[model samples]
Target chain A: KNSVSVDLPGSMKVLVSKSSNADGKYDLIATVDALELSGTSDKNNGSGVLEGVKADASKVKLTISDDLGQTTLEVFKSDGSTLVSKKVTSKDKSSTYELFNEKGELSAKYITRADKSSTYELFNEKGELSFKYITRADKSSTYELFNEKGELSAKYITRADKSSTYELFNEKGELSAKYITRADGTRLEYTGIKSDGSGKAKEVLKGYVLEGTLTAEKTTLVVKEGTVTLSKNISKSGEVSVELNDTDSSAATKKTAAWNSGTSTLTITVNSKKTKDLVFTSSNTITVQQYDSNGTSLEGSAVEITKLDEIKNALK
Target chain B: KNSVSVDLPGSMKVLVSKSSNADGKYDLIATVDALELSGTSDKNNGSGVLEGVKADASKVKLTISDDLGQTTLEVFKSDGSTLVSKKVTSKDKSSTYELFNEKGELSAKYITRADKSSTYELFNEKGELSFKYITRADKSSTYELFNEKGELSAKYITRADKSSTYELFNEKGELSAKYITRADGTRLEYTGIKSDGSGKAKEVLKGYVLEGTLTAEKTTLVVKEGTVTLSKNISKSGEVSVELNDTDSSAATKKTAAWNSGTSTLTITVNSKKTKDLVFTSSNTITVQQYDSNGTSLEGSAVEITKLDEIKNALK
Candidate 1:
C-alpha cells in the first residue's frame, strides 16, 4: 500500500488555471479548466490524471484532419509527453493510437473514419498504402497496391457474399490479368485489346464437360452428379474430342491423349467429367458439340465433349 | 449415392406444416408446417436439399412494425414471402429501416435511423418504406432529402470522392432537391423549410484553406489531378468572364458549348480541395475556377490566383 504525504508548502504555491476561454492549463499536467474525479488507485483508481481536452458531443462539430480537425483526447504522460491520441476514426467506429514513422510522419493510422470502413494505412514504410486494404459498411473489401507514382497496379475486391474479383494493370494502363470467382458461375475472360485498337482483341473460354445424364437432346442434370475444370489460352478457335473405349482399360493405358484443335497444356485429370463419363454406367457413346454466344455452331468447332464409358459394366 | 428413400408419407399426406417458428405451415398433403428438400437423387443428379434455411452468422430478424424501425437483412420470394434478407441498407451505413412519411406515414427511407443518411425510398402498393440504398460508412453518403414539412424529396449524394452521384426524387415529392458533393471548399446548403417554419434560416461557408504553394502562382493542369463542385440559386452575381477563350476561338463551333453562368442549375460535387484553376483535357477544353463555399469565381469576390500555359511543347 502507498502512503500519502500532505506537507503544506511554506509560501503555498497553489496552481490556479489561467485563461479567459474554455481551456485553461498550466505547463505540467492540466485540465479542461477543471473537469474531474479525484483520489488514488484505491479511491478513483489513479483516475484524475489530466489527459487532454475532452469534447462533448457539441464540441465534436465535424472535423477530421490531423492538424486542423479536432484532436479531442490526447493522453499525456507524467512528464506531459503525449502517450496516445484517442479519436473517432469514422462514423461507424472509434479508435485511439499513436503511429509515427521513422521520418516522423504519421506513418500508421488506426482510426475508423466517419463512414466507418477501416484500414491500417502505413506511411510508405510499416503501414504502407502499397499494401492498402480496406473494408466497407456493405461487407465489402478491397486490397490495393500502388506504385511510387501513386498509380494503381493491382487491386482485388471481395463482396460480403464471398464472391470476389481480382484485377491487375500495367504501367501504361494495360490490363495484365483479371479474374472473377462466384459460386453462381466462376468465369475466365479474355480482355485483350484488338490489334486495330477498335474492339476487344482476345478471350479464353474454358471449363470441362463432366458427367451428366445424356438425353439425346436435353437431359435434366442434378447436383449429386457433376465436369471438366480445364484451362487453355485460346488465341485461336480450339477443339476438344473424347473417344470412349467401352472396353475395360485404365486411363493410363490410353494414347498420349488426342489430337484436337489445341494444346491441353495441363495433365488430363482423372475422375474429371471425362473420367466420370468414361466410367458412366449409363450410356456407351456420346458425341460433343460447341456453339458461340450467338448460338451459331462453328463448322470445325465440333469435338467429343466427353467419351467415357464403363467397360466394367460392359455393353449397357 | 447417399440416400435410398425418404419413407413415403401415408394417404399421400405430406409431413409439412409442423414447423414451430417463422417457417410454419399446415400439412395434410404434406406440411407439418414445413417442407424439406431431402435425400439426394440418383436421377436428379444431386439436387435434393434440406433447402429451407441455412442462415449463418447472417440471418433475418422478425419485426412486427407499422412504422419507425428496421431489420438489416431480409429475403423475399416471387410471392413476396421473404426468403433471406441480406442486410442493412443505410447511406449512413445504418442497419435500420422504417421511415415514416407525412403526419405519421413511412416516407421514403433507407438510411440507418441513428446516423440519418439515406436514399430514394421505395413504396409498396399499400405504401410503406420497404427498399433502401446506402453507402457504407467508408464511402461518402447522402443525408437524404426531407421537405419543409419534412416529407422528403429528391435523394442525392456521392462518396468521399464525391464521384458518381445518385439523385432521385419520386413522382410524389419533387420540390426539394438535396445533395452534397465537393472538392476544395465544401458547402453544407440551404434546402427548403417547414410549412410552419423551423430548422435553419440558412447556412453557408467555412471549412479550411490551410496552405498555399506557388510555382509562379500556377501550373498546367492535367487529368492526373483534381476538383470540387458547389451550386446555389444564384440570381447570378454569376456572369463568368473568359479572359482567354477570349482570343482562343477554340471552344466555339464543333458541337455547341460556350462559357455562360447564371442559372446555377448546376451539379455540385464535394470534398475536393481548391486547385483554384482547373483545366480539363483530352477532347474537352473546359477551364473552370472555383471559389468559396459557393464554388464560384464571381469577380468582386475573387482574384486571379493562377494561370497555366500550353507548356508541354514549350518545355521541350
Candidate 2:
C-alpha cells in the first residue's frame, strides 16, 4: 500500500521504496520536492519541473490548469486552522461561477459573481445553515434556514402572487399550522401557534343583535310595546303593581322591576316615550296686582321655563 | 557691571553681560539661577532688570512673574534663521492657553476654558495677529483681524442689543457698511452693496395697471373690465393714413390716430376689427324636438338641444 507523509521544517524523511513481487527486488523511484521559505516549491522527478507555490497564514490561493479547464481555490484560515474555502470553476467558453465556504466548516458564506452580484448564507458552528438568501434574484425568490444540528427550520417565499407566504416548522419538523390569505387581501390570518406552546386562537363575535325569551338565575323580564312584566318562579303566592305616567320618564323607564316569591307578576305599563306629546297649558293670563317685583322680561314676552320649579317660582 | 547669561538647549545662547569701566579688579556678582533645557534669565538690580532668554528648536513657552504680574510669551522660529515672540492674552477666564508652534515660532496664541469658552489670536510666523476672537462669553463678543504687517484689516462685533447690529470694515479699517434692526424690529436694514457687488434694485411695482402712457412707445394696457382700445400714433408724413369703423360696431377696434403737430392735439375715431361675442336671453326656455319625419315625438325622452348646445359652447 502507498501512503503520503508530511515533514516539518529542519526534518528529513525517505519515502518507502516500491517493489513488485515478480521482480523480488527493490525498484527505487525517489522523488524529492524542496520547500522554500518564501513559499516556493520545486519537484525533481528526473525531469526538471520548477514551479512557484506560495502559502500564507491567513489564505492559500492556488490555480491549477489541465486539458479540461482552469480552476482556482482559495482557503481561508485563522491561526493556521482552515476556516473556509472558496472554489471558482469556469469552462473554456463559459462564464465563471463560484461556491463559497466549500470547506463545510464556515459559520457564514458570501458568494459574489464576476459581475459583483452576490448572495449570503449564514450557518451555525455545527455546519447547519441558519439563514440563506439569493441576492439580486427576483423579489419572488425564496429564503431557507436550518437549525444548528442541520435540521430544516423555516422557509419564506415572496412574489407578485396575491400575497407573500411564510412557512415555519418546530424543531420536531412538524407542520404546526398553515396561514392562508383572504380573497380581498385586507388582513392577515395569523393562524399559528408560535414555537411557544400557547393557545392558537379563539372565536371573536361582533355586531350581533339577539331577540329571544330572556331568563336569568333569579327572575325573567319580558319587554314588549314599551312595557315590561317580571315573573318569579317560587311560592304559590304573587302580587301585581302598576306604574303610572312619570314626568322623568326617560330615567324612570330604565328601572329593573323586582319580583318577590309571594308577590304577583309585576307589570310596569309605559306609554310611548316620544317627546312630541309632553306639553302643558297655562292658566292665568295677567295676575299681577302691582308692578311685578323686578321681573326681567318684556310685557309682550312669553314665559318659558326649563324646570317645573322655575315656572312655580315665576308665578309667585 | 554684572551681566546675566542663560544657556539653553539647541545651541541657543543669551548673553547679558554688564559693561565694566577701568578697574583694577572687579567681582562678578553673578546670580546663579536654576538652569533648565530651554529657559530664561532675569537680573534684578532694583531699577529695571535685564532679561535674556533662548528657546529650543522646539519652542520655549515662558511665564514670568516678578514685581510685574505674570505674562506668558511664546518664541518660534522665523523661517530657518530668526526667532519670533508673541504675548498671549485671554478675554475668557476658563481655557487652557498655549502660545507657540513646533518650530520655535509664534504661530498662534489661544486660551480654551471650561464650559467650552475659548479665545484665540492666530499669528503668522512673523508674530503678526491675523485673526482673533473671544467666544462663549457672558454676552456676545467681537472679533478683529489684522494684516500680516500688523494693520487692522477687519472687525466684527455682536452683542445682546434690542436687535443685533453687524458692522463691517474695509481692508483700510474703514466702516464701509452697517446693518441694523428697524425700530419696530420687523426687518433688518441692509443699507449696503451686497457682498457680490450687484447693482441697486429696480422695478418695485405689482398688480394690474397700465405700465406706460398711450402716447409713449411700448405702451401696455392691463384691462380689467369690458373691451379695451389700443391706439398707435401715426406720422403725418402724407405716406401714413388712418382707418376707422371699417368693421361692424360689435367687433374689436384698433385705430391709428394722427396728430396735426400745429395745435399739439390728436383726434381719432375707433374702428371695429373682429366680433366674437354670442349673446343669449336670460329667461329663454330650451326645448328638444325629435320626430320621425312625420312630426311625431319619439318614444324615448329627448334632451334639450339649446341647453346642451349652450353647455357645449361654454365648454369650448
Candidate 1 lDDT over residue span A1-316, tens digit each = 2222221111111122222222332221211211221111111111122233322211111112322122234433233343322333322234444443223345346645566677755334323343456888997998665543455555679998776776645444345445556534434332222222221111211222222222222222111101221122222222223332223245533312222334321121222222122211112122333223333322333243321221112112
**Model 2 alpha-carbon drift over 4 Å, by segment:** A1-56, A67-70, A76-84, A92-104, A109-120, A134-139, A160-162, A180-316, B1-316
Q: Scoring only the second chain, what is candidate 1's TM-score?
A: 0.27
Best by TM-score, which number? 1
* TM-scores for every predicted model: 0.25, 0.20
For model 2, how does the per-residue alpha-carbon lDDT over A1-316 read when each residue is reduced to its tens digit? 3523322111221122233334343222211111111111222111111122322234444343332243444544544446345555444322333322324355446665544446666553345555566644343555665543555555555564545555545557744433333223422222234444321221111111111111122112111222322221211131222222223346634433322223322222223222111112122111111112232222333333332223223222
- Which lDDT tens digits does candidate 1 get at residues B124-188? 22453323346554666543433223344334456675543323333355432222334523332
Tens-place lDDT per residue, model 2, B1-316, is 3356443221122343454335422222211111122232343321112233322232434443343233344444534334444553333333344444335556456666656666777554456665667766566666664543465443456665544444444434444344444223422222223334321111111111121121112222121112323222222221212112222344234432334444332233233211121121112222222233332333334333232223223212
- Predicted structure 1: lDDT: 0.31
lDDT (Cα, 0-100) at B259 in candidate 1: 28
